[PDB]
């Protein structure tokens, strides 16, 4: 029953990393101890923390209308995207580049060198990649810090799960209509998927992370490129579903190739295990 | 930024109460800290609880297959019917009657003195009842003690949400089908419902009670019950539901009315803002 | 076992008591958690979190040289002298006044309109007065909110405890070797007293005001004139105690009557039950 | 900022100090969240975990006039001497023996298999030996589990600080008279020592283990044998502080080697830094 801790590693990137973890320990506490104003004060502290970090030139958030420049003085090579407070568990969603202006903020999801979501639950988690993989971690609030739980996570080639608010049906496009009936009514006598909608992306993109399945966003008739935010929600969750062996789509490409038109730019978001994922494309290749 | 404390109150059901919170607090600091195993000792530490309290001569867990009869000398008026462990946010679900044996434990949820949930999530959350309304409370773990945080809860008369597992449309019954239809392709130019199944009951009754709406786990042909058991999981959420003016349906009668046959008994369960169940039953009286 | 919460008052006061608790919270935290490098840390959040309050004009920190003078945008009316970081348990102290300069923080302790003290133990305690009596705090980190546990706390007339460094001795003026010599050899036939001494201020303050008895850091010979600080340890306490029903004497006249003729002036310190203090007046006067 | 946890080592040893641990956790709730009550609520606590694991056959209480039997099926081959609340941090002090009777608890210290304290501070901290050595820990309660901070701490040879009740001073034997005179006027132009009693046993060992000097609860006349008991007080610090290069003497002779003549017999304690300890032994021996 007792324990020894080490410091564990994935200069200013790490820097940049630990700051992000800061301001989700303070968002943690924020939203255990809870609207608009709990989304102010999340987008304060990711902000403030990210600057002082000294490793930021430009953030992009879900909560400003124009990029943010960094202080001259504090100035380092990353750029920042994030979600501060997404969404029951809701979460906190950021993607990390290099790089004095919006351009640096405008890279394709490809470009990322590290990513991540916060999940507050009964636990606050939190899944991060740099790029060689995908590690879990859960906040320790006793110790301030976020203990390891899960290496190189990886999801299932194919779910038996998939996810989507069919309230839409009446909008969804001819694939997406295709795929939910198929998922409902197995044309190959296998039981049909269960189905699991949060409502909540970063709850929805975790279950499917650790159960396997499909998470899917996709355009419909009111929301012509669907409603998820590419920089700071669909190109973190794209890039730690890839870095645990799964895949991201919008129908038409991979989400991390799309290049980004603008910083609050939709995008549809199809993602999951591969084969679920290679499923889905196949009904929209045939429409 | 300052507070003071009163002790609140909603002799024997006062002592149960506050042992089965005790039980509740002890599940949520085990949930925090985390399958079987959770599940063999969040059973144990309900029952030795409640045992301990002197007010209980009979229980019904869903963990164990026969009722439990408590010790003659700890022996007290009341039985209470429990799932420890239910189920992304999991729970526990509790009922309480008054009175050696186990037809004790098989009156219909009518005769329900007491009854409650917990939802283990960034806040541990206890819904409550004792015949005067729902009250709302927030476990504050370094007090040890249930925060009062709403008092006499109240669902809308009418939701703009619906719940249920989709993936089972396959094995619908007609009414069900029916009634989703009608939530999807809306027959009088409203808009369609939106859809949200976290797949774990205490947390889709919870948003059900503080969004409005509907949640349905009705029969179907695989479960031709229903999956939900009405002793320890249907009663006591339809009585806190009922109690805050919504209403809780086997399909074809309260679930509160139904005369249970057995501890482990299922029924279909529909529940949630009685405009809503209303229009369920619309479609099940038509087929 | 349930509780209700009420919000408790005692505006710019308000607000200023309001974030000086905020920045305690914050220390409780730190200290939780963890030497020059925490009292570095536990003074930026006292700066920061007063001067964003819009209360402040000057500060005096235990920390820093000079006083501080709060951005001309953000002034208020009061002037706070704190001790961040004091010493087992540690401890916070502050006192406010209401006023740009220094002159505003060298009034003497009479001038006071709200003092305190934190102890951060097992739990955190907050000795609180803003000149109606004595209230006593508990944090609840879980809420993140301060509870009242004790109103108006009196100080024992008489106590049974001193408290000092007896290390000193051989450097006692005469007056103290007297007064330790009677507490020891009482003439009237009476018990010893007993005697206690964490070495740290707020931790014997504390016990002095709740248990009752004297505490002490005279003028000895290496420190003529007393090692304690008067803006910002000696008038704190001096106020809580005095509003306990206490005394609190350099030995020649109450601390709070002392002129400050310097931001980190020292002065003796003998405060308690007044009969304890009166007592070691009277060997003053003697000698 | 991201840590990654091992299970630490110092079979029915291991499940014992297991348990021992899980009851220390407990109190630390109980303490954190607060007089005989909770006395008598930490004793159970103690008694039933180490019950409930197989390793023991009989307790000692501070808390019960005799030994406590195991019951026939629980039993193993350990014996535990324990106080469950001494005593400002208070704490929890036990001693481990191999073995069916009061015999089995009457062994000299020497026997001890393994020895700790909990001290319930800002931080609920454990000083444990198996014999090779002390290991600090702190409780993560976040976590449930000890999480080691320091490796095989040792004591200074020699320290600057003595503890004790100086308002004894009239009971006081001559070797204690002489020893404390020499602390406050040393003979060889060196400086006093200062002086530190917080007058809780486990608190001002602690102190005397990390910052070195010399902890006394000597004979005197109201007290000819001393305050604090030999199986479950004295024994178990002496365990702990000789482990750390320490010293631990009645006066007459190592604590550890005293022949227990009764369960709640009390001894003279006096230890700490080695050089301080046999200081004091040289004012017993010339007088
Ligand atoms: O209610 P809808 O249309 O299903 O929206 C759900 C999505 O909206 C959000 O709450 C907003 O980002 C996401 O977290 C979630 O995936
Ligand atoms: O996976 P299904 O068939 O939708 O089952 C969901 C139900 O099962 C449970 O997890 C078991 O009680 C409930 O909490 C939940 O409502
Ligand atoms: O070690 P000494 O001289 O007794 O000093 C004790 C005093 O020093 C401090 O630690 C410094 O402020 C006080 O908290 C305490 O009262
Ligand atoms: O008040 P006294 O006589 O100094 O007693 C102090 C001792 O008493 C206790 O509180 C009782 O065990 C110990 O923790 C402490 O060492």
Do not use: W
């Not at 004095?100 to 507050?120: F, H, M, T, W």
Request: aromatic share 8%; net charge positive.
């Amino acid at each position: 029953d007792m324990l020894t801790l080490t410091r564990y590693v994935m200069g200013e990137l790490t820097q940049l990393l630990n700051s992000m973890l800061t301001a989700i320990k303070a968002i943690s506490s924020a939203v255990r101890k809870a609207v608009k104003k709990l989304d102010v004060l999340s987008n304060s502290l990711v902000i403030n923390m990210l600057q002082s970090s000294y490793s930021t030139c430009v953030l992009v958030s879900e909560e400003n209308k124009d990029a943010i420049i960094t202080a001259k003085e504090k100035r380092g090579k990353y750029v920042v995207c994030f979600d501060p407070l997404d969404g029951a568990s809701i979460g906190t969603i950021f993607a990390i580049y290099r790089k004095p202006s919006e351009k640096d903020a405008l890279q394709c999801g490809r470009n990322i060198v590290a990513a991540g979501y916060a999940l507050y639950g009964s636990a606050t988690l939190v899944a991060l990649s740099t790029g060689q993989g995908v590690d879990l971690f859960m906040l320790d609030p006793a110790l301030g810090e976020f203990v390891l739980v899960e290496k190189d996570v990886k999801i299932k080639k194919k779910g038996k799960i998939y996810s989507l608010n069919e309230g839409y049906a009446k909008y969804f496009d001819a694939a997406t209509t295709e795929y939910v009936q198929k998922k409902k009514f197995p044309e190959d006598g296998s039981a049909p998927y269960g189905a699991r909608y949060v409502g909540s992306m970063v709850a929805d993109v975790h279950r499917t992370l650790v159960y396997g399945g499909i998470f899917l966003y996709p355009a419909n008739q009111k929301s012509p490129k669907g409603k998820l935010r590419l920089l700071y929600e669909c190109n973190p969750v794209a890039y730690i579903i890839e870095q645990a062996g799964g895949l991201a789509t919008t129908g038409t490409q991979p989400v991390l190739d799309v290049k980004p038109e603008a910083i609050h730019q939709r995008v549809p978001l199809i993602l999951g295990s591969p084969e679920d994922v290679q499923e889905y494309l196949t009904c929209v290749q045939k429409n």
